[PDB]
Design a protein around this ligand. Structure first.
Ligand SMILES: Cc1cc2nc3c(=O)[nH]c(=O)nc-3n(C[C@H](O)[C@H](O)[C@H](O)COP(=O)(O)OP(=O)(O)OC[C@H]3O[C@@H](n4cnc5c(N)ncnc54)[C@H](O)[C@@H]3O)c2cc1C
Ligand code: FES
Ligand SMILES: [Cl-]
Ligand SMILES: [Cl-]
Ligand SMILES: [Cl-]
Ligand SMILES: [Cl-]
Ligand code: NI
Length: 321
């Protein structure tokens, strides 16, 4: 239904516009403003900003993204958790690196293909009208009309293509809202809204370096997409690890669809981030490394890698908040 458009005055920057049913973050990114973000889901806190003038409705007040140091300030909010209720004056430190490489849009999608990788995991491929332009390792915020007020980040598994396909592996979380849906009450022909492409943890080409991919749990999508781009780039030895709790979170490679021969998997079946240190030892620093999965598994791998020589700028990751 209807949307209102308000003025988004952002200090030090050109007057943009925000919306009444769009996060402030996706409003700014639509304007091409490199407003800091990571999860876009209320966890990282990277999208924090102060309110100089105006009002906002928070999608989720309890959001642990902002430290109570920011919360004690009182006028600080998460850009990924706010909608504009009026004209707004905000102060955020913006950075070019966040500027979208490919212009983000909200688009209409139709479920075209479903595949059960495991009982825990399900691949859904959706068709948009427009081409599916996105960088390897990026994500979309995916909404569903029947479920109002629940947007959820999901990493692209497939690669950018002219015929407008978007594929996601989603893991079933009982106790969740969105996951017990595609896993229960949805099928081919179901209608979904895709907001993207989002993410700054995408594949970097032309570094002239080895490429290591480590994906935990549902972080297979991100890890696959990177690895399946790494071999397209050079076909030099490209490494991909997978993390699962039980050896029965079925591991398949034709189901995950690469050069089976030119990609050596080291699926770890429990914590992954120890075998990676085991096999590669001190080879790490010469790799560009890419990381995805639940926050505890991801937030732990970053220090084991950082403490073992690897420069900060050589590591890339999306934590599944
Ligand atoms: C960058 C990124 C990429 C991701 N990629 C993938 C992927 O490829 N595959 C995959 O399976 N999962 C991915 N996730 C996690 C994905 O959101 C899961 O589906 C998550 O478990 C949500 O499922 P749910 O809504 O059923 O669970 P819920 O338990 O309903 O929601 C859990 C998450 O939703 C958010 N949340 C909590 N409360 C609220 C609220 N009141 N309003 C709005 N949001 C709330 C929080 O981020 C929380 O961690 C990703 C997350 C991020 C941040
Ligand atoms: S980007 Fe808003 S908290 Fe992660
Ligand atoms: Cl201002
Ligand atoms: Cl949004
Ligand atoms: Cl907030
Ligand atoms: Cl948009
Ligand atoms: Ni109205």
């Amino acid at each position: 239904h209807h949307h209102h458009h308000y003025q988004l005055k952002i200090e030090g920057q050109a007057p943009g516009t925000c919306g009444s049913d769009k996060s402030l973050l996706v409003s700014a990114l639509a304007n091409g403003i490199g407003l800091p973000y990571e999860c876009a889901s209320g966890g990282c806190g990277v999208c924090k900003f102060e309110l100089l003038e105006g009002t906002v409705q928070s999608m989720w007040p309890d959001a642990p993204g902002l430290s109570s140091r920011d919360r004690e300030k009182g006028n600080r909010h998460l850009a990924c958790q706010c909608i504009a209720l009026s004209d707004l004056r905000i102060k955020v430190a913006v950075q070019d690196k966040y500027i979208p490489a490919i212009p983000i849009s909200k688009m209409e999608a139709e479920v075209v293909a479903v595949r059960a990788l495991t009982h825990d995991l399900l691949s859904v491929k959706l068709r948009t009208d427009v081409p599916a332009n996105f960088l390897p390792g990026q994500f979309c915020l995916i909404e569903a009309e029947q479920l109002p007020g629940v947007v959820r980040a999901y990493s692209m598994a497939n690669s950018m293509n002219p015929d407008g396909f978007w594929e996601f592996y989603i893991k079933r979380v009982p106790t969740g809202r969105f996951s017990p849906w595609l896993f229960e009450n949805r099928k081919v022909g179901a209608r979904l809204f895709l907001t993207g492409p989002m993410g700054t943890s995408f594949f970097r080409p032309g570094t002239g370096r080895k490429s290591l991919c480590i994906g935990g749990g549902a972080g297979l999508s991100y890890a696959a997409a990177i690895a399946r781009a790494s071999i397209r780039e050079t076909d030099k030895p490209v490494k991909l690890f997978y993390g699962s709790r039980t050896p029965r979170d079925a591991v398949r490679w034709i189901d995950i669809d690469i050069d089976e021969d030119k990609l050596e998997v080291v699926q770890a079946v429990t914590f992954i981030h120890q075998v990676v240190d085991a096999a590669l030892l001190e080879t790490l620093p010469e790799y560009e490394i890419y990381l995805a999965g639940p926050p505890p598994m991801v937030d732990a791998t970053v220090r084991m890698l950082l403490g073992k020589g690897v420069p900060r700028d050589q590591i890339h990751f999306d934590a599944f908040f």
